[PDB]
């Protein structure tokens, strides 16, 4: 169900979390467009289980991650080639931050075997317009837009 909250101060621990089908993910939309009426920034809290990954994707917005707990590897592909290509692998750890250049293909992986990875994520121009890649070899022109994204599907249908 779509959970909307017009309240000013909200307890994040009482905002409903779900994997939405992404195995090993736990997502909460802390302050968003469809759930709370944001227009310029939207904030997520996500936990990713040991060894799990976000899909390979891009989005036309800025995106900033702040690592609250755990560690992992950020996989970055090319925006200059016609496809992402074999990715650069950049380790990250607790209390680091990283900004994804607008539109770059990337993937976040909990490469740690021992503990959960928890990140606060912020995007501009919400809600998110995510294009999914099946692999680093897939051309940018073939990536598929999945809008609404899984955590917006309920409110997007509800708004109709």
Ligand X SMILES: *[C@@H]1O[C@H](CO)[C@@H](O[C@@H]2O[C@H](CO)[C@@H](O[C@@H]3O[C@H](CO[C@H]4O[C@H](CO[C@H]5O[C@H](CO)[C@@H](O)[C@H](O)[C@@H]5O)[C@@H](O)[C@H](O[C@H]5O[C@H](CO)[C@@H](O)[C@H](O)[C@@H]5O)[C@@H]4O)[C@@H](O)[C@H](O)[C@@H]3O)[C@H](O)[C@H]2NC(C)=O)[C@H](O)[C@H]1NC(C)=O
Select from Zn ion, a second copy, ligand X, none the partner in contact with residue 3, using the beta carbon and a kind-dependent cut-off of 5 to 8 Å.
none
Q: Is 136 helix (H, G, I), strand (E, B) or coil?
A: coil
Residues in 74-93 that interact with a second copy by CB under 8 A: 74, 76, 88, 90-93
Which residue's structure tokens are 């609404």? 148
Contact between 36 and a second copy by CB under 8 A: the answer reads: yes
CB 82 within 8 A of CB 143: no
Residue 115 annotated as binding? Answer: no
- Which of 110, 103, 108, 109 lies closest to 143, judged by CA? 103
Q: Which tokens in the block code for residue 74?
A: 């950020």
Residue 106 annotated as binding? Answer: yes
Of the pair 7, 95, the CB lying nearest ligand X is at: 95
Residue 59 annotated as binding? Answer: yes
CA atoms within 13 A on the CB side of 100: 27
List interacting residues with a second copy (CB under 8 A): 8-13, 30-31, 36, 38-41, 43, 61-62, 64, 66, 74, 76, 88, 90-93, 95-99, 120, 122-125
């Amino acid at each position: 169900s779509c959970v909307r909250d017009n309240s000013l101060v909200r307890d994040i621990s009482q905002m409903p979390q779900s994997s939405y089908g992404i195995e090993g993910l736990s997502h909460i939309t802390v302050a968003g467009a469809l759930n709370h009426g944001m227009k310029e920034v939207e904030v997520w809290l996500q936990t990713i289980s040991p060894g799990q990954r976000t899909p390979i994707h891009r989005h036309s917005c800025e995106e900033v991650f702040t690592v609250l707990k755990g560690k992992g590897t950020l996989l970055m592909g090319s925006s200059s080639l016609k496809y992402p290509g074999q990715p650069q692998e950049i380790p990250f750890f607790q209390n680091t931050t990283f900004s994804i250049p607008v539109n770059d293909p990337h993937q976040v992986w909990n490469s740690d075997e021992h503990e959960d990875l928890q990140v606060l994520v912020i995007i501009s121009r919400p809600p998110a317009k995510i294009f999914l890649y099946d692999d680093w070899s897939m051309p940018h022109t073939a990536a598929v837009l999945k809008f609404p994204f899984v955590w917006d599907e309920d409110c997007f249908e509800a708004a109709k």
